[PDB]
């Protein structure tokens, strides 16, 4: 397998250790998942959001980021949550190339739709910055769940001077 073994890496002093044996199945590595997010299904129907379960050591079952576009967010302040399909991947931060293919990454800042979260405007001015994001149908949030290992699209909502730090980049930079 595409192993992940210490012997393959050089020693700290720069020694190149010859591997004692061949590569091992419990040290096996797998295909990095490139997640697919649909801006619109529109006329085409060939692609749908499908998830992959894979064989693992010990029989454990792993859900994967095969095709995930629908997304869930729980307002930290409210503790209530709403589920819809998120707009796309906006701030991978590791690479801007990943954003183009909408490859989802754990806790990568994304573009969030407000199809069921428009209800926030009914409460009086809760998170006015979120209120300005919710009516627009475009928000910022980090999908804080592991997509490749556990196939999860549930995520937190961005609130706090952390959202402002990201927003300063998200607005013109």
């Amino acid at each position: 397998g595409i192993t992940h073994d210490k012997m393959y890496k050089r020693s700290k002093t720069g020694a190149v250790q010859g591997k004692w044996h061949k590569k091992r199945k419990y040290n096996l590595g797998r295909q990095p998942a490139n997640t697919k997010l649909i801006v619109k299904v529109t006329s085409k129907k060939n692609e749908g959001q499908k998830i992959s379960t894979i064989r693992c050591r010990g029989g454990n079952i792993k859900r994967r980021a095969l095709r995930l576009s629908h997304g869930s967010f729980a307002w930290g302040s409210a503790d209530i949550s709403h589920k819809a399909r998120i707009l796309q991947v906006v701030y991978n931060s590791t690479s801007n190339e990943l954003v183009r293919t909408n490859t989802l990454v754990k806790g990568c800042v994304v573009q969030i739709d407000s199809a069921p979260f428009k209800s926030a405007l009914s409460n009086d001015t809760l998170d006015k910055e979120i209120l300005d994001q919710i009516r627009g149908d475009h928000i910022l949030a980090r999908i804080s769940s592991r997509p490749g290992q556990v196939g999860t699209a549930d995520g937190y909502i961005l609130e706090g001077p952390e959202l402002l730090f990201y927003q300063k980049k998200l607005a013109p930079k």
Binding site: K6, K9, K12, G76, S77, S93, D127, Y156, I157, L158, E159, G160, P161, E162, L163, L164, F165, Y166, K168, K169, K173
Partner: protein, 153 residues
């Protein structure tokens, strides 16, 4: 929090950075996990913007094993120090000894900055990185220049 040089914001993962927004009052702003073996933490390490996931006092790291000690020679690596322990080996053929030495790396946090020539304990921990497996806890700076003398402490 308002600075815009770092490509990304860094926060304590255990506390939601969203938990506190306005009129902060009854919530705990910093997650601190008390370390094992009862080594005291200076209030300097409890207060600050230091996250340092590698640091045990704040961040998700816990010490699980022996607590060796050595002296700090290098602190250039980012947030990392190389401590040298000395082992005196008894050889039987000649009952005289050899002062073989080892340089081991750990993770320091800005909460306890180190001077040169200090006694720094390293805690057996989760394998942090390729060379990193230890973490600093107690620092005792020695006056002037401590040199070596091959002292194991």
């Amino acid at each position: 929090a308002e600075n815009q040089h770092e490509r990304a914001y860094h926060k304590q993962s255990q506390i939601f950075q969203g938990r506190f927004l306005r009129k902060d009052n009854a919530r705990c702003l910093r997650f601190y996990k008390s370390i094992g073996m009862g080594y005291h933490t200076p209030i300097t390490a409890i207060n600050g913007t230091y996250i340092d996931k590698k640091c045990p006092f704040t961040g998700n790291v816990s010490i699980r094993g022996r607590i060796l000690r050595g002296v700090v020679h290098s602190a250039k690596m980012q947030r990392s120090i190389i401590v040298r322990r000395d082992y005196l080996h008894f050889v039987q053929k000649y009952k005289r000894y050899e002062r073989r030495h080892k340089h081991v790396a750990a993770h320091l946090s800005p909460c306890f900055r180190v001077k040169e020539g200090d006694i720094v304990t390293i805690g057996e921990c989760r394998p942090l990185s390729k060379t990193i497996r230890f973490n600093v806890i107690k620092v005792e700076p020695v006056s002037e220049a401590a040199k070596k003398r091959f002292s194991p402490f």
